[PDB]
Amino acid sequence: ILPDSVDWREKGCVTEVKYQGSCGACWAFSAVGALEAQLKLKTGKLVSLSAQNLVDCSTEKYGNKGCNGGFMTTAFQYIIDNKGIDSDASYPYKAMDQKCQYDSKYRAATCSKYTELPYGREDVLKEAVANKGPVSVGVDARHPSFFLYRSGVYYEPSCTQNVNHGVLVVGYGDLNGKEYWLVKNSWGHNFGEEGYIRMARNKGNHCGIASFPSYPEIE
Ligand SMILES: CN1CCN(C(=O)Nc2ccc3c(c2)[C@H](NC(=O)c2ccccc2)CCC3)CC1
């Protein structure tokens, strides 16, 4: 039986909200966020991982385009292939494309595998969030209402399943009769509820939240 609500922030598995600036690195933040939780679960230590490392190093070979976008799944494969990712402190975020500067002496995490969940299945997503940890997802964040979100549960009739923005599901629940997914964004603490947005859950894969979910694992 799955819990009715989950919030991975309560378990100390979620790092501070980051600010991507004018660099489309949402995919990198989503990926590191998922791996940060697994690292805490495995080692007991909560450590911010380097989104910049992904921007600079998980590039053409992974179908990624740095500040012009990328995939969380191929980011995970890069970490696997590379046998590590550096900490945020050692390889800080600059919101621009740079030369790959990965160094294993600053490695803070590894990844052994990742799992892509079946398309559109919010029940499967719920199970993964409850049993595995935070899950990287894409959402349709193109609508003016998304940028202006402040509170409550986000429901936008014009939303689509065409996803364009990488975020991290860190929980789920029910607020005043509205089921939601608890989503960590990377637009700083000014966005939404201290960097978070509650997005409609079990409302027909709203904004494509369950379209392309994935999570990494550590040996
Ligand atoms: C069968 N494939 C189906 C699609 N898929 C995904 O994971 N899609 C997905 C999942 C998440 C995200 C995106 C795509 C978007 N990334 C891009 O727009 C983009 C742009 C430039 C270069 C590379 C990718 C937005 C960020 C979040 C892999 C399996």
UniProtKB/Swiss-Prot annotation:
It is an enzyme of class 3 (hydrolase). It catalyses: Similar to cathepsin L, but with much less activity on Z-Phe-Arg-|-NHMec, and more activity on the Z-Val-Val-Arg-|-Xaa compound. GO terms for molecular function: collagen binding; cysteine-type endopeptidase activity; cysteine-type peptidase activity; fibronectin binding; laminin binding; proteoglycan binding; serine-type endopeptidase activity. Disulfide bonds join C13-C111, C23-C67, C57-C100, C159-C207. Its EC number is 3.4.22.27. It is found in: Lysosome; Secreted; Cytoplasmic vesicle, Phagosome. The active site is at C26, H165, N185. Keywords: Cytoplasmic vesicle, Disulfide bond, Glycoprotein, Hydrolase, Lysosome, Protease, Secreted, Signal, Thiol protease, Zymogen. GO terms for cellular component: collagen-containing extracellular matrix; endolysosome lumen; extracellular region; extracellular space; ficolin-1-rich granule lumen; intracellular membrane-bounded organelle; late endosome; lysosomal lumen. One of its GO terms (biological process) is proteolysis. The keyword Disulfide bond applies. Monomer. Belongs to the peptidase C1 family. Thiol protease. Key protease responsible for the removal of the invariant chain from MHC class II molecules and MHC class II antigen presentation. The bond-specificity of this proteinase is in part similar to the specificities of cathepsin L. This is Cathepsin S. The lineage of its organism: Eukaryota, Metazoa, Chordata, Craniata, Vertebrata. The gene is CTSS.
